[PDB]
XYZ file of C-alpha atoms in Angstrom:
223
model
C -7.390 6.821 -33.819
C -9.693 3.670 -33.691
C -12.632 1.947 -35.399
C -15.142 0.397 -33.108
C -15.863 -3.505 -34.000
C -18.690 -6.197 -33.521
C -17.946 -9.704 -32.015
C -20.261 -12.303 -31.860
C -21.911 -11.658 -27.907
C -22.350 -8.379 -27.879
C -18.607 -7.726 -27.712
C -15.909 -5.031 -29.382
C -12.917 -4.783 -30.088
C -11.539 -1.544 -30.932
C -9.127 -1.524 -33.807
C -6.700 1.104 -35.049
C -7.799 3.482 -38.460
C -4.327 2.931 -39.700
C -1.354 0.459 -39.288
C 1.775 1.138 -37.652
C 5.525 1.437 -39.302
C 5.609 -2.523 -39.321
C 2.259 -3.172 -40.814
C 0.214 -3.893 -37.711
C -2.698 -2.968 -36.493
C -3.356 -2.114 -32.690
C -6.824 -3.668 -30.826
C -7.678 -2.950 -27.466
C -10.738 -4.687 -25.518
C -12.736 -4.696 -22.522
C -13.211 -7.960 -21.392
C -15.044 -8.768 -18.045
C -14.295 -5.386 -17.092
C -10.477 -6.009 -17.633
C -8.758 -4.507 -20.804
C -6.436 -6.356 -23.201
C -4.619 -5.206 -26.067
C -2.890 -6.583 -28.418
C -1.672 -5.869 -32.385
C -2.699 -8.026 -35.575
C -1.742 -8.089 -39.493
C -5.133 -7.721 -40.131
C -7.311 -4.587 -40.171
C -10.683 -6.419 -39.565
C -10.381 -6.602 -35.943
C -9.227 -10.415 -35.635
C -6.520 -10.835 -33.866
C -4.778 -12.151 -30.285
C -5.035 -9.548 -27.247
C -3.688 -10.063 -23.485
C -4.178 -8.502 -20.139
C -3.394 -9.688 -16.289
C -6.109 -9.642 -13.959
C -5.510 -8.002 -10.381
C -4.797 -12.248 -8.900
C -2.051 -12.359 -11.758
C -3.954 -14.374 -13.954
C -3.327 -14.250 -17.568
C -6.030 -13.889 -20.027
C -6.126 -13.808 -23.259
C -8.617 -13.514 -26.214
C -8.636 -14.895 -29.746
C -10.229 -13.130 -32.251
C -10.747 -15.667 -35.620
C -9.619 -14.069 -39.063
C -13.067 -13.940 -40.348
C -14.660 -12.807 -36.611
C -16.872 -15.819 -36.559
C -15.631 -17.138 -33.037
C -13.886 -15.337 -30.254
C -12.089 -17.857 -27.498
C -11.373 -16.095 -24.017
C -8.689 -17.850 -21.808
C -8.075 -17.329 -18.769
C -4.177 -18.917 -17.195
C -2.604 -19.379 -14.555
C 0.081 -16.352 -13.733
C 2.855 -18.226 -15.002
C 0.862 -18.871 -18.906
C 1.447 -22.616 -18.348
C -1.719 -23.962 -17.227
C -5.248 -23.213 -19.167
C -8.059 -22.712 -16.216
C -10.621 -21.726 -18.086
C -12.200 -20.649 -21.782
C -15.184 -19.467 -23.090
C -16.070 -19.892 -26.780
C -18.221 -17.444 -28.662
C -19.428 -18.925 -31.923
C -20.843 -16.393 -34.714
C -24.572 -16.572 -33.641
C -22.890 -15.158 -29.745
C -24.005 -18.222 -27.706
C -21.313 -19.769 -25.773
C -19.276 -22.690 -24.567
C -17.716 -21.956 -21.238
C -14.888 -24.575 -20.081
C -13.930 -24.286 -16.958
C -12.251 -26.506 -13.998
C -9.968 -27.473 -16.687
C -7.613 -30.473 -15.973
C -4.276 -31.429 -17.656
C -5.903 -33.874 -19.733
C -7.659 -31.307 -21.210
C -10.834 -32.457 -19.542
C -13.548 -29.791 -17.338
C -16.916 -28.496 -16.793
C -18.517 -27.344 -20.046
C -21.965 -24.920 -19.959
C -23.546 -23.745 -23.397
C -25.285 -20.346 -22.957
C -27.635 -20.549 -25.373
C -30.831 -17.887 -26.460
C -33.397 -19.337 -23.574
C -31.166 -22.205 -21.943
C -27.835 -23.063 -20.848
C -26.746 -26.987 -21.071
C -24.700 -28.147 -18.528
C -21.856 -31.360 -19.379
C -18.716 -32.368 -19.752
C -15.534 -31.756 -21.543
C -12.412 -34.541 -22.278
C -9.848 -33.646 -24.683
C -12.127 -35.869 -27.501
C -15.113 -33.682 -27.358
C -17.722 -31.992 -25.142
C -20.653 -33.445 -24.614
C -23.837 -31.643 -23.204
C -26.807 -33.774 -21.912
C -30.232 -33.249 -20.780
C -31.845 -35.838 -19.124
C -35.997 -36.735 -19.147
C -37.403 -39.926 -17.395
C -35.159 -42.721 -18.919
C -33.817 -40.882 -22.072
C -30.559 -38.969 -22.431
C -29.986 -36.889 -25.093
C -26.219 -35.752 -25.563
C -25.317 -32.899 -27.452
C -21.194 -33.661 -28.843
C -19.081 -30.851 -30.037
C -15.903 -31.831 -31.062
C -12.892 -29.626 -30.769
C -13.257 -27.888 -33.899
C -17.445 -27.124 -33.038
C -19.425 -29.740 -35.037
C -22.737 -30.774 -33.496
C -23.724 -34.177 -33.192
C -26.320 -35.670 -31.009
C -27.466 -39.112 -29.963
C -29.897 -40.319 -28.196
C -30.416 -43.056 -25.482
C -33.121 -44.376 -23.269
C -33.244 -46.984 -20.556
C -37.118 -47.865 -21.393
C -37.391 -51.551 -21.607
C -40.673 -51.379 -23.595
C -40.989 -50.857 -27.258
C -44.461 -49.499 -26.832
C -42.501 -46.590 -25.753
C -38.848 -46.530 -25.551
C -37.461 -43.789 -27.702
C -34.526 -44.291 -29.821
C -33.147 -41.932 -32.472
C -30.724 -41.963 -35.775
C -28.197 -38.700 -36.205
C -27.829 -37.127 -40.021
C -25.100 -35.256 -39.798
C -26.350 -33.882 -43.051
C -29.289 -32.095 -42.262
C -27.982 -32.035 -38.468
C -31.587 -33.268 -37.088
C -31.869 -36.120 -34.794
C -34.650 -38.139 -36.011
C -36.817 -39.910 -32.910
C -38.573 -42.924 -33.359
C -41.123 -44.660 -30.737
C -42.454 -48.451 -31.837
C -41.164 -48.695 -35.253
C -42.285 -44.541 -36.524
C -40.985 -41.487 -36.387
C -42.267 -39.642 -34.013
C -40.304 -36.019 -34.594
C -36.974 -34.088 -36.193
C -34.637 -32.056 -33.576
C -32.732 -29.983 -35.710
C -29.922 -28.413 -34.142
C -29.781 -25.364 -36.469
C -25.962 -23.777 -37.361
C -27.732 -21.106 -35.142
C -27.603 -23.203 -32.158
C -31.428 -23.725 -32.031
C -32.615 -26.490 -31.516
C -36.401 -26.928 -33.642
C -38.664 -29.973 -33.137
C -41.228 -30.679 -35.909
C -43.385 -33.927 -35.445
C -44.286 -36.396 -37.967
C -47.605 -37.950 -38.539
C -49.254 -40.697 -36.916
C -47.174 -43.021 -39.458
C -43.984 -41.850 -38.853
C -43.633 -41.353 -42.693
C -44.203 -37.779 -43.248
C -43.635 -34.583 -41.431
C -46.291 -32.288 -40.205
C -47.177 -28.939 -39.142
C -43.976 -26.520 -39.244
C -40.513 -26.541 -36.874
C -41.299 -25.068 -33.465
C -38.000 -23.467 -32.085
C -37.504 -24.530 -28.660
C -36.858 -21.422 -26.295
C -36.249 -23.496 -22.611
C -35.141 -26.442 -21.282
C -38.609 -27.425 -20.318
C -39.259 -27.857 -24.484
C -35.877 -29.728 -25.077
C -37.697 -32.352 -22.107
C -41.134 -32.423 -23.486
C -39.417 -33.340 -26.604
C -37.771 -36.233 -25.540
C -40.822 -37.875 -23.242
């Protein structure tokens, strides 16, 4: 019979204990109440599973080789048009792409622990946006999942205008106001955000980094 393998996002796939005559393993999973099935040349739960909804939509679950990501795609009934794509990362958070158009654009929602970020998808990138006052924080995610962040403030006052620099080496957005760094927003590989303030001179971090748990805390950091 079968082995239950845990997948990101508190999901599971059942994999046959042994392979069939072709060396393949059977996979079965139920996602959004639909039973999907497939076969794989790996024994770990990775591979592709498919099913068809009552409305004839085609559903494909793809579980990456190292179990670090799953993709749940829904297509129109001929399988030729992708309608939605939900990408679940190793940390369990997910990106939901919906209203996908023929140029690869669509709506994007990132479901984090404690909050949701909303934005858009283009063929190039996903951009999730948080606005607060005159500040817009944009979390950009490449097609391969690489995160970069930018900030733009339309405030026309040096006393108060925020600017920010992205450090791709440390996944950190450093905000500056009136020539002083004010805080580091770290976008962790856990897909969490932490905030840590600088001292009043902008030249040393103080305290300890605090993990953001709700949208209001992101907005507070952008004030």
